[PDB]
């Protein structure tokens, strides 16, 4: 995730890199069933459908 | 002529004909199609001569392979059908047989039942006239 030129325009983009790293890593630190894995994956997929379109 | 559509027959002829009539009546349809059979042809003939439906035409392809019959249902200028309720008594595995003296009367004679005794399909009142009983096809009123 290397990107930086002078001071801050890369830092403003660092926030986006981290948030998504945090979201993806947060589901590899607690264990739950595969069925729940798929259920929460589909629930998250509905969320993108509601706002990002 | 030029039906440009594939049509097939459901199952035993008695049940196949009634369901089309009932569904067309409920959905306000006017024209339907089905495969032809001499029992179905005769029952459609007796039905039209009992004044329950319009034209039927039995259609054959440019060969002696398939025969189909299409029949229009009687309606009114105010769009109310003549057919009120159809119910078949004969049934595969439940062949019903009543003698002449136990010949039913559909809704006090208002309706018409199809009773093919010995001379093809044949109405209940003319059955009493000929005092011969046999197969009971379906109640129509």
């Amino acid at each position: 995730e290397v990107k930086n030129d002078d001071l801050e325009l890369a830092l403003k983009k660092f926030k986006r890199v981290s948030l998504e790293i945090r979201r993806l890593a947060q589901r590899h630190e607690y264990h739950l069933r595969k069925g729940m894995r798929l259920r929460e994956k589909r629930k998250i997929a509905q969320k993108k459908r509601r706002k990002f379109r | 002529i030029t039906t440009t559509k594939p049509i097939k027959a459901h199952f035993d002829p008695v049940a196949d004909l009634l369901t089309k009539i009932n569904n067309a009546r409920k959905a306000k349809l006017m024209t339907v199609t089905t495969i032809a059979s001499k029992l179905k042809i005769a029952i459609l003939e007796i039905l039209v001569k009992e004044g329950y439906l319009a034209n039927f035409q039995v259609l054959e392809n440019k060969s002696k392979t398939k025969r189909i019959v299409t029949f229009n249902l009687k309606y009114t200028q105010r769009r109310i059908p003549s057919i009120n309720g159809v119910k078949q008594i004969s049934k595969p595995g439940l062949r019903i047989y009543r003698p002449f003296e136990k010949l039913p009367l559909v809704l006090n004679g208002l309706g018409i039942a199809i009773i093919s005794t010995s001379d093809g399909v044949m109405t209940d009142k003319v059955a009493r006239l000929k005092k011969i009983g046999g197969e009971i096809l379906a109640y129509v009123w």
């Binding site: - | 002529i1 030029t2 039209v48 440019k62």
Partner: protein, 167 residues
């Protein structure tokens, strides 16, 4: 059925011993020949494989019976100069019907669709316009005749007009 194979070799080594390795591997295959030996030269690896940082990408294009793989597969792993042994077979996702191959017309017309060398580049590829030749070539007919002409009737209408008149 068609076959394709990609070879990974020991990097910094030169080209003639790579051809010698090719020739050695040629006999390793079974009685299936009629293959080309065009190669992709030397390309830098995206990541280290065992210890090397580069290698040569090579290719076979033979076709024959299913026995062609077993001996080459078992001798590729043991050899110290062979790194990867991908075996492409016809089971890839493809279709090359002779009637669908002549889509080069799509290439030529798409080239025009990308021609925007002038200032007036108002054309946009993602823009419907609804042209159509519309050659139907599909009716699905079923001829029919008449056999029984029971009591005819005429047509009518179902136009509704209630109550007729007020008073």
């Amino acid at each position: 059925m068609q076959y394709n194979i990609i070879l990974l070799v020991d990097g910094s080594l030169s080209l003639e011993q790579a051809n010698q390795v090719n020739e050695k591997q040629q006999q390793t295959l079974t009685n299936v020949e009629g293959l080309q030996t065009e190669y992709l030269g030397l390309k830098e690896l995206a990541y280290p494989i065992k210890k090397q940082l580069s290698a040569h990408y090579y290719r076979w294009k033979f076709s024959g019976d299913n026995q062609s793989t077993k001996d080459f597969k078992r001798t590729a792993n043991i050899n110290k100069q062979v790194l990867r042994e991908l075996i492409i077979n016809l089971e890839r996702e493809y279709g090359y019907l002779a009637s669908i191959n002549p889509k080069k017309q799509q290439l030529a017309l798409q080239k025009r669709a990308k021609y925007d060398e002038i200032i007036a580049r108002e054309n946009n590829p993602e823009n419907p316009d609804v042209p159509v030749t519309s050659g139907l070539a599909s009716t699905q007919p079923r001829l029919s005749r008449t056999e029984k002409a029971q009591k005819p009737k005429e047509e009518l209408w179902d136009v509704v007009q209630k109550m007729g008149n007020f008073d």
